[PDB]
Amino acid sequence: LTRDGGSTNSTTETFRPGGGDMRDNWRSELYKYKVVKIEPLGVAPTRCKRRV
Amino acid sequence: AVGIGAVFLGFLGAAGSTMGAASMTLTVQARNLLSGTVWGIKQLQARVLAVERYLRDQQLLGIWGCSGKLICCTNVPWNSSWSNRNLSEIWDNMTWLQWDKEISNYTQIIYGLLEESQNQQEKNEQDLLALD
């Protein structure tokens, strides 16, 4: 849908169908996935020490 | 000194013989493993398949006790319910090809045992150097 850009003090808000891009049909189905990248090798302090 | 002694064979050369004699040479079987217009895609996927396999094997060896020892020992005792063989016969009687069909059932468990053993040993020595 698409709202009409109604200025000048009117209480009704009409709506109209509008096709436009083809991208929105896929955006109706990929609204639930983001892609993330793994990162290993953290580093943290603790109480141990390497012997010679 | 040596008139005629067994020099060395190619890779998989010893593989008919017994395991005791075959364990003398491993480096030959290890070295011949890395390296020695649509067709370029087939060659490139062949090469990356090769290095993918070798890297999987290196990682799987790394997560146990021995990274690059090429011969290891560890702290998991052999349960005789798997093999039911004497010690005296295996090193002087059978080949690895003969061996693999005998130990084929009990796999994929021993690997997890090695994983847990190395993990517990690492956390215990971690606690040891923690109080050190």
Nearest to B109 by CA among B84, B82, B132: B82
Examine residue B16 and state whether it is found in any structural domain, yes or no.
Answer: yes
Two tokens, residue B112: 């997890």
Coil, strand or helix: which one is B44?
helix
The answer for residues whose C-beta is within 8 angstroms of residue B64's C-beta and 6 or more apart is: B72, B74, B114, B115, B118
Resolution of the experimental model in angstroms, please?
4.0
User: Which of A:27-46 have CB within 8 Å of B?
Assistant: 46
Instruction: Check B126 against A47: CB less than 8 A apart.
Output: no
Examine residue B74 and state whether it is found in any structural domain, yes or no.
Answer: yes
Examine residue B2 and state whether it is found in any structural domain, yes or no.
Answer: no
Provide the domain limits for residue B36: 9-132
The experimental method, as deposited, was cryo-EM
Nearest to B29 by CA among B4, B9, B59, B43: B9
Is any Cβ of chain B less than 8 angstroms from the Cβ of A49?
A: yes
Examine residue B92 and state whether it is found in any structural domain, yes or no.
Answer: yes
Amino acid at A13: E
Examine residue B83 and state whether it is found in any structural domain, yes or no.
Answer: yes
Q: How far apart are CA B51 and CA B34, in angstroms?
A: 7
Find the residue in B nearest to A50 (Cα): B129
Domain count, chain B: 1
Instruction: Check B132 against A48: CB less than 8 A apart.
Output: yes
Examine residue B127 and state whether it is found in any structural domain, yes or no.
Answer: yes
Coil, strand or helix: which one is A3?
strand
Two tokens, residue B92: 């002087």
Examine residue B38 and state whether it is found in any structural domain, yes or no.
Answer: yes
Residues of A in contact with B130 (CB under 8 A): 46-48
Q: Cβ-count burial of B71 within 10 angstroms (0-12 exposed, 13-18 middle, 19+ buried)?
A: exposed
H or E segment and range at residue B119: helix B110-131
Are the C-beta atoms of B96 and B22 separated by less than 8 Å?
yes
Examine residue B31 and state whether it is found in any structural domain, yes or no.
Answer: yes
Residues of A in contact with B132 (CB under 8 A): 48-49, 51
